[PDB]
From Swiss-Prot:
The modification N6-acetyllysine is found at residues 42, 68. It comes from Homo sapiens (Human). GO terms for cellular component: apical plasma membrane; axonal growth cone; basolateral plasma membrane; brush border membrane; cell surface; cytoplasm; cytosol; dendritic growth cone. The TPR repeat-binding motif mediates interaction with TPR repeat-containing proteins like the co-chaperone STUB1. The gene is HSP90AA1. Keywords: Acetylation, ATP-binding, Cell membrane, Chaperone, Cytoplasm, Host-virus interaction, Hydrolase, Membrane, Mitochondrion, Nucleotide-binding, Nucleus, Phosphoprotein, S-nitrosylation, Stress response, Ubl conjugation. The keyword Ubl conjugation applies. This is Heat shock protein HSP 90-alpha.
Length: 207
């Protein structure tokens, strides 16, 4: 298990998301589904010039898996996945500019729901989750598990769990007062409101 410090701007953003009073928390789901859709668009585009990129799985979809027993909401996709370099360095380096722009926009009157306009929508997961675990598999790398409960650090390890084939699974370990996001009616309402035109099948698993 390797432990890393977040980029300073990202730790600041995470603290702002955790500490700001903001009732419209449901937007985290739209952000995470949008991110999955982007990863799916990426593998679909790459597979046009290299069909072998789909040898790890032809189906392009998103599954939403609430679990009342573990108090987790899992968002699974069969997108392009992420390399170890993406998890440790690349995505966080890119997120520095968007984080700075988003925090400046909030000071000027923007609200937390606008987070996706800055390329840092993933961090809205901390509106509802005390911990986030991300399992990912890219065709050019091994399967990894990234994890953070904020506090300024995250961990990365090789994942020994069940192989995924290709894609990303975001596991949200929900805060005790955010269990509404495990209810079928609530998740259906949010998907219909914010993600009705996503161009991939979204299957909401029943418990
Ligand atoms: C270290 C930071 C990790 C944060 N992390 C987990 C997320 O951001 C995130 N959340 N849900 C996701 C679903 C996914 O399939 C993927 C994924 O596999 N790829 C390739 C991906 C990468 C970047 C993006 N952005 C989209 C917005 O603009 C920045 C890049 C969209 C997809 C990433 C997801």
């Amino acid at each position: 298990v390797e432990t890393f410090a977040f980029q300073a701007e990202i730790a600041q953003l995470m603290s702002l998301i955790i500490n700001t009073f903001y009732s419209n928390k449901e937007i985290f789901l739209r952000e995470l589904i949008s991110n999955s859709s982007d990863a799916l668009d990426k593998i679909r585009y790459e597979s046009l010039t290299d069909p072998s990129k789909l040898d790890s799985g032809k189906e392009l979809h998103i599954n939403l898996i609430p679990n009342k027993q573990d108090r987790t909401l899992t968002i699974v996709d069969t997108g392009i996945g992420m390399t170890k370099a993406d998890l440790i360095n690349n995505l966080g380096t890119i997120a520095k500019s968007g984080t700075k722009a988003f925090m400046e926009a909030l000071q000027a009157g923007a609200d937390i729901s606008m987070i996706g306009q800055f390329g840092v929508g993933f961090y809205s997961a901390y509106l509802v989750a005390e911990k986030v675990t991300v399992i990912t598999k890219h065709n050019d790398d091994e399967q990894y598990a990234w994890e953070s409960s904020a506090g300024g650090s995250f961990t990365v390890r090789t994942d020994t769990g069940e192989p995924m084939g290709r894609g990303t699974k975001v596991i949200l370990h929900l805060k005790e007062d955010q269990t509404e996001y495990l209810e079928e009616r609530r998740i259906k309402e949010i998907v219909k409101k914010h993600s009705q035109f996503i161009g991939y099948p979204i299957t909401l698993f029943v418990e």
